Amino acid sequence: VNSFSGYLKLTDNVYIKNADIVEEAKKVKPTVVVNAANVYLKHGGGVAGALNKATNNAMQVESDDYIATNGPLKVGGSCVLSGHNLAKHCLHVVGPNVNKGEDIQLLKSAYENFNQHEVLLAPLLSAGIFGADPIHSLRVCVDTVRTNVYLAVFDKNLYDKLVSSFL
Ligand SMILES: O[C@@]1(CNc2ncnc3[nH]ccc23)CCCSC1
Ligand SMILES: [Cl-]
């Protein structure tokens, strides 16, 4: 039993809710919140921009030190950093950005990072400003993640379509 509330159950381990991931994380304080990161951990917009703003830019400061030490992530890769005031940990995961021409096949590799964590609060990878089809992202999530994932979908209209079209 966990403290996630109000989700629809899609499978044994995948759940979904119309919610602002920032407001969700502040309420639940999950062990792991997933950020929709880029390889430079530059959290300018989208989910990343919103999560960073909620940390008062502390996420960005920590991320800049991480990059200065380690260099960029790989597309499909991840790193674990602090969750600041939102969660214990933030798993920064880089899905392919279609608007940069990145290979959508890497979306499965991106979701594989979730399997290293027993429970996660997460957005749909490569959705929104990363330009992939969110129905596809949900399919890849369900077919790749085996740990317990609670998906927050900000847009109510998109949330309704994801449920009604789910196979
Ligand atoms: O959910 C999205 C990604 N974007 C966000 N998700 C959750 N919380 C958020 N807060 C700010 C942005 C944001 C992908 C599925 C279709 S709708 C957009
Ligand atoms: Cl977005």
Choose the residue to mutate in 26, 154, 159, 162 for probing ligand 1, maximizing ligand atoms within 8 Å of C-beta. 154
- The answer for residues whose C-beta is within 8 angstroms of residue 74's C-beta and 6 or more apart is 39, 94
> Is residue 2 domain-resident?
no
State whether the beta carbon of 125 lies less than 6 angstroms from ligand 1.
Answer: no
143 in Cβ contact with 8 (< 8 Å): no
Which ligand lies nearest the alpha carbon of 17?
A: 1
Resolution (A): 1.0
Say how many domains are in the chain. Answer: 1
> Is residue 15 domain-resident?
yes
Other beta carbons within 10 angstroms of residue 138's beta carbon come to: 23
Domain membership of residue 147 as a residue range: 8-163
119 in Cβ contact with 32 (< 8 Å): yes
29's torsion region: left (phi>0), alpha (psi -120 to 50) or beta?
A: left
CATH code for the domain of 73: 3.40.220.10
> Is residue 119 domain-resident?
yes
> Is residue 120 domain-resident?
yes
DSSP string, the chain: --S--S-EE-SSSEEEEE--HHHHHHHH--SEEEEE--TT----SHHHHHHHHHTTTHHHHHHHHHHHHH-PPPTT-EEEEE-TTT-SEEEEE----GGGT--TTHHHHHHHGGGGSSEEEEPPTT-GGG---HHHHHHHHHHH--SEEEEEE--HHHHHHHHHT--
State whether the beta carbon of 159 lies less than 6 angstroms from ligand 1.
Answer: no
141 in Cβ contact with 166 (< 8 Å): no
Choose the residue to mutate in 26, 93, 129, 153 for probing ligand 1, maximizing ligand atoms within 8 Å of C-beta. 153
Tell me how far CA of residue 117 lies from CA of 30, 68, 112, 135, 143, in angstroms.
Answer: 11, 26, 10, 23, 16
> Is residue 1 domain-resident?
no
> Is residue 3 domain-resident?
no
51 in Cβ contact with 21 (< 8 Å): yes
Q: Whose CA is nearest to atom 13 of ligand 1?
A: 47
